Amino acid sequence: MEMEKEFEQIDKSGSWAAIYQDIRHEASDFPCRVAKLPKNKNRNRYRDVSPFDHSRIKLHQEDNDYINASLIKMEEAQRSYILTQGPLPNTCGHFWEMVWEQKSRGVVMLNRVMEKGSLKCAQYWPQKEEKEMIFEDTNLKLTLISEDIKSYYTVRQLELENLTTQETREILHFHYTTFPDFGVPESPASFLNFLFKVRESGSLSPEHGPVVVHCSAGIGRSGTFCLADTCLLLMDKRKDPSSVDIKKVLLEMRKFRMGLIQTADQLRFSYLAVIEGAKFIMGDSSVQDQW
């Protein structure tokens, strides 16, 4: 496959930094006026990571409709993702309101609450069955239903209830707990196994609203997850591991949210994942068992 030729030639000449810088230079720049309004300062985790106005998710409140979240709509792949920052202590209600209004079935969390000894995300889901959470501002109730903990990720079944209406929904929470503080995993196997666990759940499927994906800023690891998934989908649709250009798909996604893929490392790991994942896509269904 042509992607494996490119990977090996970029590696051979140690120009990943150069390739990645090129992507930074060519990436879209759109306005983020609403994110930057004074009233929204405390709704943003990082001053340098903002949703573009044109693709931002709007909350359906007439109060303040702002949340730091972007709709990434991949037209050809026929997949949509919402990428958002890790909820702040004051934005957990907004987060779950978005999940509700967007009709999402899955939340994919790619960070730990604490990394590098600092808090990266608020504790926005309940950790015990008997202690549900109520978000008074958005009138939603959230209850931990079950939790399946594996060595490198955890899946939880949550019940989200709209207290206004009393309709309830099941949300699946996919928590990848072993993406390293620095660098990236040496093997994409754990990551791919995770992604396919999300896929098998139905969470990425067209019957539902777009999956919600976040890490701390919602661009690095979040970008890696969506990039790999979309690339594998395009390869599957076309059955042509050669026609799928990962740098172009990445640039396409960056039309919808800035900064997707934060380091040359994450770029290289993205190639790694797509290359290894394409073995499964192309008819070798046994590679999933070895992941």
The DSSP string of 43-79 is G-S-TT----GGGEEEPS-SS--EEEEEEEEETTTTE
Q: Which amino acid is at 259?
A: G
Which residues are the active-site residues? 215
Question: Number of H helices and number of E strands within the chain?
Answer: 9, 11
The structure was resolved experimentally with X-ray
To the question of whether residue 14 is assigned a binding role by annotation, the answer is no
Q: Does the CA dihedral 252-228-226-89 come out positive or negative?
A: negative
Domains held by the chain: number = 1
To the question of whether residue 203 is assigned a binding role by annotation, the answer is no
> What is the Cα–Cα distance from 189 to 153, expressed in whole angstroms?
13
DSSP secondary structure code for residue 153 in this structure: E
Three-class DSSP category at 145: strand
Q: Counting beta carbons within 10 angstroms of the beta carbon of residue 184, is it exposed (0 to 12), middle (13 to 18) or buried (19 or more)? A: buried
Q: Backbone phi, then psi, for 17, in 5-degree steps? A: -60, -45
To the question of whether residue 262 is assigned a binding role by annotation, the answer is yes
What are the Cα distances from residue 227, in Å, to 73, 126, 269? 12, 29, 11
User: Under 8 Å CB-to-CB from 196, ≥6 apart: which residues?
Assistant: 280, 288, 291
Q: Does the CA dihedral 145-150-187-202 come out positive or negative?
A: negative
Q: Which domain holds residue 254?
A: 1-291
Residue 100: give its domain's CATH number.
Answer: 3.90.190.10
To the question of whether residue 18 is assigned a binding role by annotation, the answer is no
Resolution of the structure, angstroms: 2.0
> What is the Cα–Cα distance from 249 to 221, expressed in whole angstroms?
16
